[PDB]
């Protein structure tokens, strides 16, 4: 389309190193049943652990983006009804503007 | 959960200019590195045929036959075309 564009490929760590310092409980020390409402967090197709109350973890990233601290390209999705946090950086994602 | 819709755009990547070259630059840059060897492995004691890269890149963008020369069609036939100058729009 006209408005459409494409990801170029950002870097993870500045979001990884950002996360584990705002809630994410590393996967090394994870215990299933102990956390059922576990909304395990994903980034560029990797499981870097989980995180409890995500409601905030989300609107924190969103406004982190909307300022320019997280490349406005990068995409992060919250699949509530499945307790999953999808965050992408990948190079090749078609995207419009709204 | 239903099966996974193979045709969901958010799961389709569009390898553009850079990426494509990237690929080339790698596989090529290695044939150079494994040829820089052939100079030392003979030095019983200036060896950089820069042409390799230069020519390679042409060949590719030239035809469109990415994966390279030799005895193989190996590449994806049809990348890199001749811009259309039929109209501005087109």
């Amino acid at each position: 389309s006209l408005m459409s564009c494409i990801s170029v490929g950002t870097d993870p760590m500045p979001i990884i190193t950002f996360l584990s310092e705002w809630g994410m409980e590393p996967l090394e020390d994870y215990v299933p049943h102990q956390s059922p409402d576990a909304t395990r967090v994903f980034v560029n197709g990797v499981w870097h652990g989980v995180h409890r109350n995500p409601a905030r973890l989300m609107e924190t990233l969103r406004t982190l983006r909307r300022k320019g601290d997280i490349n406005p390209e990068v995409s992060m999705i919250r699949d509530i009804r499945e307790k999953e946090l999808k965050i992408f950086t990948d190079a090749g994602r078609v995207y419009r503007p709204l | 959960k239903d099966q996974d819709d193979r045709d969901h755009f958010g799961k389709k990547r569009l390898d553009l200019a850079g990426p494509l070259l990237a690929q080339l630059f790698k596989t090529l840059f290695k044939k150079l590195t494994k040829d820089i060897f052939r100079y030392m492995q003979r030095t019983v004691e200036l060896a950089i045929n820069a042409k390799t890269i230069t020519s390679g890149l042409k060949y590719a963008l030239a035809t469109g036959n990415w994966g390279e020369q030799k005895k193989a069609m190996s590449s994806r036939a049809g990348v890199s075309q001749v811009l259309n100058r039929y109209t501005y729009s087109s």
């Binding site: - | 553009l16 200019a17 850079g18 990426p19 070259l21 990237a22 630059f25």
Partner: peptide, 30 residues
């Protein structure tokens, strides 16, 4: 995409299995 390839990407490729049994530093684009 090209920009990206040139600026960053370009450099990253050169630095990986580069070094031999000789090293490769920065890269210039004239």
């Amino acid at each position: 995409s090209f920009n990206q390839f040139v600026d960053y990407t370009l450099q990253d490729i050169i630095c990986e299995d580069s070094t031999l049994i000789i090293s490769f530093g920065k890269i210039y684009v004239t």
